[PDB]
Amino acid sequence: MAFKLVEATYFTFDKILKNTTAFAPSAKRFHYQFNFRELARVCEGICRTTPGQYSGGDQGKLVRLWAHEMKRTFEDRFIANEHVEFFRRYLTEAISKCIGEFPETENPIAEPLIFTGFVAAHQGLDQQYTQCTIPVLKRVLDDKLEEYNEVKAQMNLVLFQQAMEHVSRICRILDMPGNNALLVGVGGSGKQSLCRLSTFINGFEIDQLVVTASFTINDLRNNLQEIYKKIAKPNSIARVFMITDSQIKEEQFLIPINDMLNSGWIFDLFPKEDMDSLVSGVRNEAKGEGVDVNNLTALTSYFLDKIRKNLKVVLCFSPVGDTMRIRSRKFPGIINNTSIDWFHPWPHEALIDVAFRFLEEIEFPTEEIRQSISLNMAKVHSSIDTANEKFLKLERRYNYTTPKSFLELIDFYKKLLTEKRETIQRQIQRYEMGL
Amino acid sequence: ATIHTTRLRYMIDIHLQRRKPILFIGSAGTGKTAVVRDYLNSTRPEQVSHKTINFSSFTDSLALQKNIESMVEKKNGRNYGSATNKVLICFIDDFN
Amino acid sequence: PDIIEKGIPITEGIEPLKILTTEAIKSKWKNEGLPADPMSLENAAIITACARWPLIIDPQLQGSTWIRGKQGENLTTISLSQPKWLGALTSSISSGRAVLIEGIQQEIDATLDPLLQRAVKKNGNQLQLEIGGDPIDYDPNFKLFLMTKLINPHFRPEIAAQCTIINFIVTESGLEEQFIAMVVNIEKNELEM
Ligand SMILES: Nc1ncnc2c1ncn2[C@@H]1O[C@H](COP(=O)(O)OP(=O)(O)O)[C@@H](O)[C@H]1O
Ligand SMILES: Nc1ncnc2c1ncn2[C@@H]1O[C@H](COP(=O)(O)OP(=O)(O)O)[C@@H](O)[C@H]1O
Numbered sequence: 001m002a003f004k005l006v007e008a009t010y011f012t013f014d015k016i017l018k019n020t021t022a023f024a025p026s027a028k029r030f031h032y033q034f035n036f037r038e039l040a041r042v043c044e045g046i047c048r049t050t051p052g053q054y055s056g057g058d059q060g061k062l063v064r065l066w067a068h069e070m071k072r073t074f075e076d077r078f079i080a081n082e083h084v085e086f087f088r089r090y091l092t093e094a095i096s097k098c099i100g101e102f103p104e105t106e107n108p109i110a111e112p113l114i115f116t117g118f119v120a121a122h123q124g125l126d127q128q129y130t131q132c133t134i135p136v137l138k139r140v141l142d143d144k145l146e147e148y149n150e151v152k153a154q155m156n157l158v159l160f161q162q163a164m165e166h167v168s169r170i171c172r173i174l175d176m177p178g179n180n181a182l183l184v185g186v187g188g189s190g191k192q193s194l195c196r197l198s199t200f201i202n203g204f205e206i207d208q209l210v211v212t213a214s215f216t217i218n219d220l221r222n223n224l225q226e227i228y229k230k231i232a233k234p235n236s237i238a239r240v241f242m243i244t245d246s247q248i249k250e251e252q253f254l255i256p257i258n259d260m261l262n263s264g265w266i267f268d269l270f271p272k273e274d275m276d277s278l279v280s281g282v283r284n285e286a287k288g289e290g291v292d293v294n295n296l297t298a299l300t301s302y303f304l305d306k307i308r309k310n311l312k313v314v315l316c317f318s319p320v321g322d323t324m325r326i327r328s329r330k331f332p333g334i335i336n337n338t339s340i341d342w343f344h345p346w347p348h349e350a351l352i353d354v355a356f357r358f359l360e361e362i363e364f365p366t367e368e369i370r371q372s373i374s375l376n377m378a379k380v381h382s383s384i385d386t387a388n389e390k391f392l393k394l395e396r397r398y399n400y401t402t403p404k405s406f407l408e409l410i411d412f413y414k415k416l417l418t419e420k421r422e423t424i425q426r427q428i429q430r431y432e433m434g435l
Numbered sequence: 436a437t438i439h440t441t442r443l444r445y446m447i448d449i450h451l452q453r454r455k456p457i458l459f460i461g462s463a464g465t466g467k468t469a470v471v472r473d474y475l476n477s478t479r480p481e482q483v484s485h486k487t488i489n490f491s492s493f494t495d496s497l498a499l500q501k502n503i504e505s506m507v508e509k510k511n512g513r514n515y516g517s518a519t520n521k522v523l524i525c526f527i528d529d530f531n
Numbered sequence: 532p533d534i535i536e537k538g539i540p541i542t543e544g545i546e547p548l549k550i551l552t553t554e555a556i557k558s559k560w561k562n563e564g565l566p567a568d569p570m571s572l573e574n575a576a577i578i579t580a581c582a583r584w585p586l587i588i589d590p591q592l593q594g595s596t597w598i599r600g601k602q603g604e605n606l607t608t609i610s611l612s613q614p615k616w617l618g619a620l621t622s623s624i625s626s627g628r629a630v631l632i633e634g635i636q637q638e639i640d641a642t643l644d645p646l647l648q649r650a651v652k653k654n655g656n657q658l659q660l661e662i663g664g665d666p667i668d669y670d671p672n673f674k675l676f677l678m679t680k681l682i683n684p685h686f687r688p689e690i691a692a693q694c695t696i697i698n699f700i701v702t703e704s705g706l707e708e709q710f711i712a713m714v715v716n717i718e719k720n721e722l723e724m
């Protein structure tokens with residue numbers, strides 16, 4: 001089955017290269033470029049699977065896992081839902097060729113099918129990565145969110161199916177050692193808040209830099225420098241690093257971060273004498289590991305491996321201008337080294353759940369109004385995107401509609417309705433007393 | 436190891452004995468950096484002394500010299516080279 | 532139609548102009564250099580009910596003249612080009628009825644980004660908003676209006692969400708409707724009065 005999966009992953013990879021018109025390097029396809037790394041991390045994530053849980057018949061269970069993992073490094077690469085459809089057809093043809101005979105009852109690849117090694121940690125399984133059902137995922141995330149609210153700063157979110165899937169595939173990139181996560185989406189997509197949650201789900205400690213109005217390159221270096229002191233110590237939880245487009249006030253602040261995220265740590269971050277004192281602390285660990293000590297070559301190397309494993313870099317950009325594309329062109333490390341993750345707009349089914357959550361704890365005549373309003377809230381936002389597509393073709397004037405725009409609209413509507421209802425109630429009470 | 440890497444691996448050993456530098460070209464996917472990075476580990480740390488340099492598109496000529504200065508030890512006179520006749524290798528990535 | 536299909540309790544004849552604002556306040560606006568066409572009333576009705584800061588697009592400065600009429604007292608217009616615009620805005624945020632920003636066509640300055648955000652930080656009784664190096668004391672009933680003179684202006688979609696966009700452009704039938712209201716007042720003055 002291993003050999004078949006290698007020919008399969010190639011077959012899918014090869015059918016995409018053949019369709020140069022569909023997928024190619026472009027201005028808006030700076031990342032679309034298909035490397036070894038995406039095949040490598042696919043091959044890496046199979047190696048993550050422990051023997052004891054995958055022991056037995058691997059005719060049904062492996063192809064599912066592979067297909068998922070394959071899908072999550074290719075879907076995120078694609079921006080358009082058209083490109084997605086083309087890929088799924090190539091993936092089915094590829095599987096059906098190498099496997100030969102497979103049941104038509106259950107599609108090998110399916111949107112419902114997710115794989116995560118955080119669900120295992122909740123159920124008391126140790127280093128286990130398997131397929132998790134949508135309803136099980138809901139219960140774990142909802143429980144963990146209550147734990148996050150208890151200790152860290154309270155974050156409200158809808159926790160719809162598509163947002164939860166986005167939590168799963170970020171948790172997955174953080175579980176892989178050395179590999180860095182890149183989140184791309186429009187302003188308000190929840191990605192920064194989904195990352196902070198996703199980090200907390202796993203056993204990792206998130207550290208975001210705070211940018212003041214007046215900031216300097218040397219001030220950034222000192223914030224990073226502090227983070228590397230916590231990683232250097234042997235018995236340390238792996239530090240995640242959070243960055244957004246707003247946090248990057250100038251392009252000079254990005255240069256250090258890319259050299260960190262590419263490999264090891266930025267050249268001449270600390271002095272040579274300070275580096276020597278960090279190396280000595282790691283030497284005590286190396287004895288326990290059983291790696292060659294007092295070699296001063298393999299040890300220094302081992303220090304760079306540990307630092308790489310314990311530093312995770314999370315980047316957040318918006319693909320709205322050609323400024324992000326200029327970042328890709330300028331900064332080579334970012335697009336190739338990190339694992340891209342693209343946020344699509346919220347589905348019609350998800351928007352209904354958002355409205356249904358905000359309408360809760362508001363009085364209504366029969367609460368059937370609530371369930372209907374929640375539909376109309378989704379229908380109105382969708383009908384704007386269809387009108388916005390019509391507006392883009394008809395006139396040169398560009399309008400943009402984001403999920404934060406939608407959230408803020410709902411809060412304003414709710415406040416206006418509550419104020420009008422309160423005024424009407426006061427007037428009716430006065431009229432009743434007078435009567 | 437691959438058929439393609441082993442034959443390039445031989446070409447590097449040939450090109451390391453000589454003072455002739457090597458330049459690798461190909462797409463992002465091809466896996467050049469790793470093939471060089473494997474070799475630098477397999478080389479003896481006394482004979483050859485390896486260092487990686489990565490340009491992020493803001494690396495000025497002055498900043499490159501600071502990286503070279505640190506790599507090269509101070510020989511007798513104006514000349515700067517490694518002590519005990521060690522050969523100094525500087526690896527460059529994202530050259531263009 | 533989609534409100535009737537669901538069957539949600541609503542009045543038989545709804546129009547957005549009536550909800551946003553009463554009839555009397557439309558008659559006030561008419562006096563303050565506004566036309567009687569519904570498109571301009573809708574636009575004027577939006578900025579009143581806006582939960583976000585309103586970015587206005589005004590070729591022929593039709594919107595700007597209305598804003599100046601409405602804000603009769605303590606209105607200050609500060610262009611991006613002015614060198615003390617950071618210092619003026621900070622002193623305005625503390626004790627300013629209203630603020631107007633000229634130009635700001637596209638690429639909005641990073642110093643305004645925290646102000647543009649409707650979320651404000653409350654320190655005890657007082658409210659504090661962080662603009663520039665030093666935080667400045669925020670007072671309630673502060674208004675911020677952003678006017679931009681352009682045709683097909685291009686904004687960041689993150690900004691189009693953050694700040695509600697509204698256009699005062701007199702085009703097609705939109706200008707016709709204004710001339711009718713003007714003509715009617717000259718022709719049948721008695722009926723309008
Ligand atoms: N699913 C959601 N449910 C509720 N509120 C949300 C949701 N997603 C985002 N938000 C709100 O909108 C904000 C979006 O900002 P952020 O999470 O940083 O995303 P982005 O980087 O796309 O702007 C959140 O901080 C939160 O206040
Ligand atoms: N034998 C190999 N095993 C694993 N990865 C390899 C191997 N050979 C090359 N690679 C890949 O090579 C890449 C690093 O070198 P290279 O592709 O030249 O880098 P770049 O694309 O930045 O020029 C990584 O994707 C790495 O996985």
Ligand SMILES: [Mg+2]
Pocket residue numbers: 188192
């Ligand atoms: Mg945000």
Ligand SMILES: [Mg+2]
Pocket residue numbers: 468469528
């Ligand atoms: Mg490389």
